Design a protein around this ligand. Structure first.
Ligand SMILES: [Mg+2]
Ligand SMILES: [Mg+2]
Ligand SMILES: [Mg+2]
Ligand SMILES: [Mg+2]
Ligand SMILES: [Mg+2]
Ligand SMILES: [Mg+2]
Ligand SMILES: [Mg+2]
Ligand SMILES: [Mg+2]
Ligand SMILES: [Mg+2]
Ligand SMILES: [Mg+2]
Ligand SMILES: [Mg+2]
Ligand SMILES: [Mg+2]
Ligand SMILES: [Mg+2]
Ligand SMILES: [Mg+2]
Ligand SMILES: [Mg+2]
Ligand SMILES: [Mg+2]
Lengths: 95, 53, 87, 97, 140, 287, 196
RNA sequence: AAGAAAUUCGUAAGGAGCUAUAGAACUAGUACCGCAAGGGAAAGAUGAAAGACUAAUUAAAAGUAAGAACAAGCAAAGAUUAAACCUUGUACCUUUUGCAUAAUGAACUAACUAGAAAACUUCUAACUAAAAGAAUUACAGCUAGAAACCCCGAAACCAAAC
RNA sequence: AACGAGCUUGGUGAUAGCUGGUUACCCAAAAAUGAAUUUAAGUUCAAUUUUAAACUUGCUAAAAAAACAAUCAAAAAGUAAGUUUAGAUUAUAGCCAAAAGAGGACAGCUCUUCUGGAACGGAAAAAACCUUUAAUAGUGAAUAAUUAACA
């Protein structure tokens, strides 16, 4: 990680994260299942069904990605017609 | 304190000063000086009573 | 040559002890030293012993013949305690 | 150790000289002056750090940006080496990752 | 040299002033004095709780000597004195022997008599009135 | 007051007496004492203690977690997606109630920003304000609001109370001037034309039901009536309403501001407006 | 505010060379082994007399920061009350004085029981009377400033404060504008509908 | 790991520095060292007057002297009438396992000689569906303050001179 | 004047998972097991530990009854902790005694599992065994292990 870049003096986003994970404004992260496109001819139908899903990240993994991405990737985005509109907030959670 | 102990002559000499100083003289001739710099009234009162005893 | 005035000051007092203690000065009567009033100290002397005293009588007791003669000579350039001593 | 054998000369400060007396005046030039001038504009200092603050690596790069082309050869060489040392320190060393 | 310690002289003095009575270079060199002083302070702390055990062993030596003059072993003297309900610690008993020899003989005789009474009670079984000194006072 | 009375008795306030607020500052721990010195919090001898441990995301040598997950297009094209800072009807009514929006005058993006009703960032791909259905029930205000995106239910609230809702497209250059007019006038450049929506947005802004500015005027009546039947209210007659001219007011499709034509220049210092007399420039601007 | 009026201006010019900027120290003094001495790679190191400082001041440093606009304005309001309640603030119609002699001004302060150091605030620099200008200039303690130059630090340093009536109105409007105002859409200097 | 642009914005003499192991290597690129390129020091101190016989100032560092030693022992501590005799007591640091009678390092004195950054968190305030002195963030936030991450050392590698 | 490939300057404050070092007081809490790794002189995660906050049951014990001295656990009782959330590391080689397996249905030896310890007191020796709830001043006191055995 570049903690202080020469030209600007700012932290730099890791683009390996931007191309694999989606952050919801609450703080959750979405990911795919590794191998969901690999050797599908020998996987069971139930196995394939699990792979197609989108999965969440843990507290540690979420903490890591928040260190490898900059605040710009942690803002509110008002996209019209967004298919993730309802998932950016947590409701009826006491904890 | 002065009335309670009438055998202790008390001298108070306010002067332009940096550290307040108490000098105790005993009858055998021994001297003792203790620095009172930035001590509250409670500390001084307790400190003085030790000197008298 | 370091900064500050305080380090010298603490050492100046250290020099003070070295000179005074190695070569002490001759003793000086407590009268010459600061914080002396004759009358107040005389009063405390009676109170310290718990015995009520006649202040005028006590003053005469401390007076001595030698002191009177020295004072008179200085004046040129007040009753003795002899009667009290005999009694 | 060793200590001075004499007291150093007394240091006397005149607290009512012109510079001390008027210190701070015009710090509110903006809010009380219809925001004509920002108070940062009153700072006297190096051109590259008037009204700006940053850590040494940022300070090094900022000095280069403003006066990089007007610097002496040896000074510029040392600055370049100073930047490269700081870069590897702040971006590759330290207790925390 | 923006900031330098101008009072290091007195910091060395604190360590050195506790080493003058030593012998050798340890009384004047800070690198050597400092190590010597710490042991001196530690021993002083580990000896505040050894004079309270030696001073007692001194007393037992002198009480053993004192009772032996009158023919009593140390165990007999102390135990019987307690059994008579008289409580005197080992510090005054040494004082009594050294400075009040006549009083100690009374204690020696009293301790001896109770020892005899105890022997009689064990030797004579059954319900018999115990010795005059054997009688124990009770506090409620 | 009573607390103020105490200050009178206390000594004069001076530079010596200054004190920071309780607990405002923290002690800065330095490495010069036993607890924080010696090994200085870095443990025994090793890589992390030499100061040279590996980078973040390095898991010792096995394939890292972040690199071993398939790349997916969650964030693809994010920088070119269109953003509309939504406006609800609760905020609209709340703003109108407190006198921070003038309902009698026509409403536009400039008067929303002026009354701080909405905050817009053109540099972050904002393309305008989308009206939202939240708060329709409490909405009982008649107002001519122009918003780039509208909704079916949001339209009902405006129309039922007897108001005009229109949707107009402002391109990135136009939006910046609309949100922030004054500086543009300070630049000294002439006012620009407003480009038509790109092909993707053409169907929306030409659709009658969406109340598009380019939509056919003739089809509006029918579309409003169908919506009126759907939500169980009777269409009010705006024409009879005294302020028909104001409500009906609509800016030209090539106008950023209602009362200013493209190509003019505004001189704030002299309090004048300059209009080009050149025929060639007029041709370009009129287009 | 008092600390702010101290720090943001501050720029420190203390600097120390590091072990690379020190002249020389290129060659390795001696081989690692065979000589019975410790291992060194340059005669200019932090462990060497004449070497480069380890963690010293580097370049010019800046301590620039600005408090929020309302915070610094609030400080002025607080300072104004403190002087008023402690009977250190005197309100005057105009600064006109009978004579330019500095002695009169100093004597008047003692007569009226003002503090040794007096701060005088006038509405504008240009209109200030000539008589006051001559007197205050000759006096170190009596410092004269215009209305726009009011600052918290000056009031804290000066015992009493003399305010002209128009300046009080000037200060009252400026500070009370800070509350009841929006957040700036622009830099304020740019044209605004209702701002001077 | 690197990293734009379009497009906006702008009229710009001092020291909370050093004071002879510090600040420049510098009293000097001199002495000295190398065939050469090249490397590279150390230090001074009277007073108004020396046309007043060069002052002062200090139980003050290690080192000595004044004043060698007197059964017995990590050199001390508890003590004591008494300096030593009597009792108690396996140098220090680092290090090994959390053990050393080990193994490293230190003849002694003076001076010098090594933790530094604000993404997330905590604490303290200003205003508050708004905060920010232009671009930022927001389903109580936002702004400002304080609070953080060392030193010395290779065998080597490349360029250009000698 | 030490050539498996000269020397000087510069790159250069080369780099070092390795060796060495890292400067005031005080109070408090406090562990070398599992996984992967050109990994076993390292790092990362789990587990443990810790500072704060939220609110409520937690530890020992736990009858019957299951699956067979344990895995599980209900009323009780003795007692004050346990769960969740936010932040953060170092650590990842043990040492010795005593129990029980398992390697050749052996002892040992090498492992594995449970238990305990880290005196100033005691056991010729004496960090590991036995007596010992923290640390403070006193010229008080009662005591523990043990001070060998008299077969
Ligand atoms: Mg720090
Ligand atoms: Mg591999
Ligand atoms: Mg926005
Ligand atoms: Mg160099
Ligand atoms: Mg070289
Ligand atoms: Mg090197
Ligand atoms: Mg230097
Ligand atoms: Mg020098
Ligand atoms: Mg030099
Ligand atoms: Mg000497
Ligand atoms: Mg001896
Ligand atoms: Mg050695
Ligand atoms: Mg290194
Ligand atoms: Mg384990
Ligand atoms: Mg390996
Ligand atoms: Mg390793």
């Amino acid at each position: 990680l570049t903690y202080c870049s020469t030209r600007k003096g700012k932290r730099k986003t890791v683009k390996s994260v931007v191309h694999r994970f989606l952050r919801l404004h609450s703080g959750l992260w979405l990911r795919r299942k590794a191998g969901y496109k690999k050797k599908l001819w020998k996987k069971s139908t139930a196995r394939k069904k699990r792979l197609r899903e989108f999965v969440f990240c843990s507290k540690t993994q979420s903490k890591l990605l928040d260190k490898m991405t900059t605040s710009f990737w942690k803002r509110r985005n008002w996209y019209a017609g967004d298919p993730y509109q309802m998932y950016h907030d947590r409701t009826n959670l006491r904890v | 304190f002065a009335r309670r102990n009438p055998g202790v002559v008390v001298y108070v000499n306010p002067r332009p000063c940096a550290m307040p100083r108490i000098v105790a003289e005993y009858l055998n001739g021994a001297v003792r000086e203790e620095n009172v710099n930035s001590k509250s009234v409670e500390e001084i009162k307790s400190l003085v009573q030790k000197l008298a005893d | 040559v370091k900064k500050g005035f305080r380090a010298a000051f603490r050492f100046q007092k250290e020099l003070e002890r070295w000179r005074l203690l190695r070569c002490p000065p001759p003793p000086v009567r407590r009268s010459e030293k600061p914080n002396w009033d004759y009358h107040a100290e005389v009063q405390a002397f009676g109170s310290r012993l718990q015995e009520t005293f006649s202040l005028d009588l006590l003053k005469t007791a401390f007076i001595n013949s030698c002191y009177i003669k020295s004072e008179e000579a200085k004046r040129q350039s007040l009753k003795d305690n002899q009667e009290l001593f005999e009694q | 150790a060793f200590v001075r054998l004499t007291l150093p000369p007394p240091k006397v400060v005149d607290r009512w000289n012109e510079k001390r007396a008027l210190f701070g005046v015009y710090d509110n030039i903006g809010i009380l002056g219809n925001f004509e001038k920002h108070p940062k504009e009153l700072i006297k200092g190096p051109v590259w750090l008037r009204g700006w603050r940053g850590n040494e690596l940022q300070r090094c790069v900022r000095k280069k940006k403003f006066v990089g082309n007007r610097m002496f050869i040896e000074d510029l060489h040392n600055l370049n080496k100073r930047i490269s040392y700081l870069y590897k320190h702040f971006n590759r060393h330290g207790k925390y990752r | 040299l923006r900031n330098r310690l101008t009072d290091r002289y007195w910091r060395v003095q604190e360590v050195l002033k506790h080493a003058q009575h030593f012998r050798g270079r340890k009384n004047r060199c800070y690198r050597l004095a400092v190590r010597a002083v710490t042991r001196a302070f530690v021993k002083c702390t580990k000896a505040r709780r050894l004079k309270k055990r030696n001073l007692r062993t001194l007393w037992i030596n002198r009480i053993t000597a004192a009772s032996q003059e009158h023919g009593l072993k140390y165990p007999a003297f102390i135990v019987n004195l307690i059994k008579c309900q008289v409580e005197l610690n080992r510090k005054v008993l040494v004082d009594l022997a050294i400075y009040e020899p006549k009083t100690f003989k009374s204690l020696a005789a009293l301790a001896k008599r109770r020892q005899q009474e105890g022997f009689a009670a064990a030797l004579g079984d059954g319900k018999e009135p115990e010795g005059i000194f054997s009688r124990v006072v009770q506090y409620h | 007051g009573t607390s103020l009375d105490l200050l009178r008795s206390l000594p004069r306030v001076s530079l010596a007496n200054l004190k920071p607020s309780p607990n405002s500052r923290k002690r800065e721990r330095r490495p010069r004492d036993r607890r924080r010195g010696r090994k200085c919090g870095r443990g025994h001898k090793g890589e992390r203690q030499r100061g040279t441990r590996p980078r973040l995301g390095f898991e010792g040598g096995q394939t890292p977690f972040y690199i071993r997950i398939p790349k997916y297009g969650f964030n693809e094209g994010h920088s070119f997606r269109h953003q509309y800072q939504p406006l609800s009807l609760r905020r609209l009514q709340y703003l109108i109630d407190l006198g921070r929006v003038d309902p009698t005058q026509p409403i536009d993006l400039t008067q929303l920003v002026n009354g701080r009703g909405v905050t817009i960032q053109p540099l972050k791909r904002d393309y305008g304000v989308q009206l939202v259905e939240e708060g329709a029930d409490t909405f009982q205000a008649k107002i001519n609001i122009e918003v780039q995106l509208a909704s079916e239910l949001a339209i009902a609230a405006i129309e039922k109370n007897g108001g005009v809702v229109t949707t107009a497209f402002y391109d990135p250059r136009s939006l910046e001037i609309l949100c922030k007019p004054i500086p543009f006038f300070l630049r000294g450049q002439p006012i620009p034309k407003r480009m038509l929506p790109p092909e993707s947005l053409v169907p929306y802004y030409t659709d009658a039901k969406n109340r598009g500015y380019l939509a056919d005027p003739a089809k509006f009546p029918e579309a409003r009536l169908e919506l009126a039947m759907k939500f169980g209210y009777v269409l009010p007659d705006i024409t009879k309403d005294e302020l028909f001219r104001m409500l009906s007011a609509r800016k030209d499709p090539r106008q950023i501001f209602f009362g200013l034509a493209p190509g003019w220049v505004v001189n704030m210092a002299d309090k004048k407006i300059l209009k080009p007399t050149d025929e060639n420039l007029l041709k370009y601007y009129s287009s | 505010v008092a600390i702010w009026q101290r720090n943001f201006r501050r720029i420190s010019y203390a600097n120390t060379k590091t072990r690379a900027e020190v002249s020389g120290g290129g060659r390795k003094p001696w081989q690692q082994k065979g000589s019975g001495r410790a291992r060194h790679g340059s005669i200019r190191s932090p462990l060497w007399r004449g070497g480069g400082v380890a963690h010293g001041p580097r370049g010019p440093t800046s301590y620039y920061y600005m408090l929020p606009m309302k915070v610094r304005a609030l400080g002025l309001k607080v300072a104004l009350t403190v002087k008023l309640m402690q009977d250190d603030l005197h309100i005057v119609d105009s600064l006109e004085l009978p004579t330019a002699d500095p002695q009169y001004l100093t004597e008047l302060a003692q007569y009226r029981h003002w503090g040794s150091s007096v701060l005088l605030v006038d509405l504008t620099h240009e209109e200030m009377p000539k008589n006051v200008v001559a007197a205050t200039s000759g006096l170190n303690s009596f410092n004269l400033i215009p209305a726009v130059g009011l600052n918290v630090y000056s009031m804290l340093k000066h015992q009493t404060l003399v305010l002209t009536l128009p300046s009080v109105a000037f200060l009252e409007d400026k500070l009370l504008w800070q509350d009841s105002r929006y957040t700036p859409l622009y830099p304020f200097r740019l044209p605004y509908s209702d701002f001077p």
